[PDB]
Amino acid sequence: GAMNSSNYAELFNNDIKLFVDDTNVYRVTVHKTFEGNVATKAINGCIFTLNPKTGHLFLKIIHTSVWAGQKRLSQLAKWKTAEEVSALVRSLPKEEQPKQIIVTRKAMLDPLEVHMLDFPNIAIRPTELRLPFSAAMSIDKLSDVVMKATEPQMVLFNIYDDWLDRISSYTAFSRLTLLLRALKTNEESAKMILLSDPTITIKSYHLWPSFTDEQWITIESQMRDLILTEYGRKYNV
Amino acid sequence: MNTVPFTSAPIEVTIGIDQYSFNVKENQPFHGIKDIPIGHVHVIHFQHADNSSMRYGYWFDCRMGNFYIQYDPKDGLYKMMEERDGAKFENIVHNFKERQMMVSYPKIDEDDTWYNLTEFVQMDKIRKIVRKDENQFSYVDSSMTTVQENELSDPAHSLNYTVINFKSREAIRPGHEMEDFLDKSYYLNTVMLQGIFKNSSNYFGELQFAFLNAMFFGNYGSSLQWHAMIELICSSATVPKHMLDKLDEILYYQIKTLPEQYSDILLNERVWNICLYSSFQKNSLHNTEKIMENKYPELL
Ligand SMILES: COc1ccc([C@@H](N)CCO)cc1
């Protein structure tokens, strides 16, 4: 079935599952042509495939060459996403294959279902949550690897850095979604927050700064203030 | 012209013969139906005055034997039977036609409706979908389920329609996932027409038989089959031009013949709006689209 606030802790049980987000697969700049018409120019994209229990992120980089000579790109993008996800499952040993894949947009259900017909025991599910994974390109090191790529390429990250050494996956996923929700509502403010203090650094093998527990609590409070703030600034409340 | 004689009518019943139907009162002196046109399949069907639950009936072709109906008071229904003694069948029928205890199949001479609804339907194919090989006629009723319905439970009493499934390995070639799902030509032409049905006549015949079972018996599984087979053609970019033209006629007569008051249950809003306004063949069903829009503008 669909995933929502009520079966929310299923994410953190011991059945392997992945979230798939396609909102950054097909990305364009829209510009004026010499004749005064409008044209698009594609830039590199990525498929965001995330195991929410372990933090493993399978970042499939989508090089702009994949769109060359193709029509109806927004529709192809969902099928390209499904093809890459199916290839990833096929590449994993059987005991690492997911038992469920949860797509963050319902338009992905049919493309993935068709690409996964060989895997009748993998359940493909939508969700009612408004998850902020489109803001993953606001994470500097992820945006950097996508923009620099010159060919199709997959890069493996742990989007939780070393957090699971200290907190649970439930709490780790809640931190991540709070960070991404903030980056999505006001990217500049959110980034000012994470990096204002020069003494806190990002380890070379990490995506986020090395905060102490007490500093994370202060950070998380500031992201909540932001997300509430911009909600007044937006709704005049 | 052939005759379906009845031993008696012990229970009040609405009798259908093809697209016609008439009331028979309990123990009225009724002894069957005459002047039934040779050359076509026919269906004779029944709805008891008491239990409007379960419409049921029999597909048959008079060329294949002498058939009669007799009420069975143990099983509680009008049963079709075969009389092999032809001489003995003749003396039963003549006697009834002399005493004028029969209704006449009431075909108007301008009317090709029944032909147009059964053009491709053939008893040999009906008997493969309705498996019961000791009889030359085939029983259907409202409640029978299809073979695909039993996959999602008695196999003997099932409708063995051809399974159509747009998200199946049979429908989708490896490496052509997007192509084959958005343009079903491969599945229609190679899998179904070439592989399974052999020709489009056998395909149209199953489609027509599915519609008729949906209309006459309100068989839900047949309606699903009828819609699936339409949708498969409408979602194929490459269809033989003769099939499109023939499909438009076939659907035209089906829509024409549907009871206006059953449109809400027998007509799937999504399939028809897709087929008429979105699909590859959205411009190729001119007759069907004109009658649908003038008769059921609601569903659209
Ligand atoms: C009303 O038509 C009928 C009625 C009875 C028969 C016979 N088979 C019955 C004797 O076994 C045949 C036809």
Q: Does A111 touch chain B (CB under 8 A)?
A: yes
Q: What angle do CA B149, B150, B155 make, to 5 degrees?
A: 125
Q: Which residues line ligand 1 (CB under 6 A)?
A: B 5, 7, 68, 83, 89, 92
Q: Does A53 touch chain B (CB under 8 A)?
A: no
Q: Does B50 touch chain A (CB under 8 A)?
A: no
Residue A25 corresponds to which tokens in the numbers above? 């697969």
- CB neighbourhood size of A13 (10 A): 10
Q: Which atom of ligand 1 is nearest to the CA of B70?
A: 1
Cβ-nearest to A113 among B167, B169, B178: B167
| Closest to B38 in 3D by CA, of B5, B3, B69, B67 | B3
**Method of determination used here:** X-ray
CA distance B172 to B190: 12
- Strand ranges inside chain A, DSSP E: 17-21, 27-32, 38-43, 45-50, 56-62, 100-103, 123-125, 153-158
Pocket mutation for ligand 1, best pick of B2, B7, B79, B97 (most atoms within 8 Å of C-beta):
B7
- Please tell me if the domain spanning A9-163 has the same topology as the one spanning A164-237: no
Residue A107 corresponds to which tokens in the numbers above? 């338009």
Chain A contact set for B168 (CB, 8 A): 117
Pocket mutation for ligand 1, best pick of B6, B62, B68, B90 (most atoms within 8 Å of C-beta):
B68
- Residues 6 or more apart from A165 whose CB is under 8 A from it? none
Cβ atoms B193, B200 nearer than 8 A? yes
CA distance B15 to B32: 10
End-to-end Cα distance, chain A: 36
Tell me which CATH code domain A9-163 carries: 3.30.420.230
Cβ atoms B66, B134 nearer than 8 A? no
The residues spanned by each domain of chain A are: 9-163, 164-237
C-alpha distance from residue B259 to each of B43, B103, B216 (Å): 17, 23, 10
CA distance B273 to B293: 11
CA distance A81 to A76: 8
Q: Which atom of ligand 1 is nearest to the CA of B32?
A: 1
Radius of gyration for chain A, computed over Cα atoms and rounded to the nearest angstrom = 19
Strand order in the sheet with A56-62: A123-125, A100-103, A17-21, A45-50, A56-62, A153-158
Ligand 1 mean position, distance from CA A165 (Å) = 87
Yes or no, beta carbons of A76 and B178 under 8 Å apart: yes
Find the closest chain A residue to B166 by CA distance: A114
| Closest to B41 in 3D by CA, of B111, B102, B125 | B125
How many Cα atoms within 13 Å fall on the side-chain side of residue B151?
11
Q: Which helix (H) or strand (E) holds A80?
A: helix A73-91
C-alpha distance from residue B239 to each of B195, B234, B236, B246 (Å): 16, 9, 6, 11
Distance from CA of B4 to the nearest CA of A (A): 50
Distance from CA of B181 to the nearest CA of A (A): 8
| Closest residue to atom 1 of ligand 1, CA basis | B7
Q: Which atom of ligand 1 is nearest to the CA of B7?
A: 1
The tokens 């932001």 sit on which residue?
A226
The tokens 């329609």 sit on which residue?
B161
Yes or no, beta carbons of A79 and B168 under 8 Å apart: no
End-to-end Cα distance, chain B: 42
Q: What angle do CA A222, A224, A227 make, to 5 degrees?
A: 110
Cβ atoms B3, B93 nearer than 8 A? yes
Task: Mutation target for B interface from A117, A119, A122: give the one with most B CBs within 10 A.
Answer: A117
Pocket mutation for ligand 1, best pick of B62, B70, B91, B99 (most atoms within 8 Å of C-beta):
B70
CA distance A86 to A126: 17
Chain B contact set for A111 (CB, 8 A): 177-178, 181
Q: Does B172 touch chain A (CB under 8 A)?
A: yes
| Fold entry, domain B116-299 | 1.25.40
- Reduced to 3 states (helix: H, G, I; strand: E, B; else coil), residue B56 is strand
Q: Does A83 touch chain B (CB under 8 A)?
A: yes
The three state secondary structure string of B73-132 is: CCCCEEEEEECCCHHHHHHHHHHHHHCCCCEECCCCCCCCHHHHHHCCCCHHHHHHHCCC
Long-range contacts of B151-156 (CB under 8 A, 24+ apart): B156/B131, B156/B132
Tell me which CATH code domain A164-237 carries: 1.20.80.40
How many Cα atoms within 13 Å fall on the side-chain side of residue B170?
12
Chain B contact set for A117 (CB, 8 A): 167-169, 172
The CA-based diameter of chain B, rounded to the nearest angstrom, is 70
Residue A151 corresponds to which tokens in the numbers above? 């060919």
Neighbour-count burial of B277, counting CB atoms closer than 10 A to its CB (0-12 exposed, 13-18 middle, 19+ buried):
exposed
Distance from the Cα of residue B237 to its chain's centroid? 27
Q: Does A87 touch chain B (CB under 8 A)?
A: no
- Residues 6 or more apart from A36 whose CB is under 8 A from it? none
Q: Does A82 touch chain B (CB under 8 A)?
A: yes
| Closest residue to atom 7 of ligand 1, CA basis | B83
The tokens 């075969």 sit on which residue?
B82
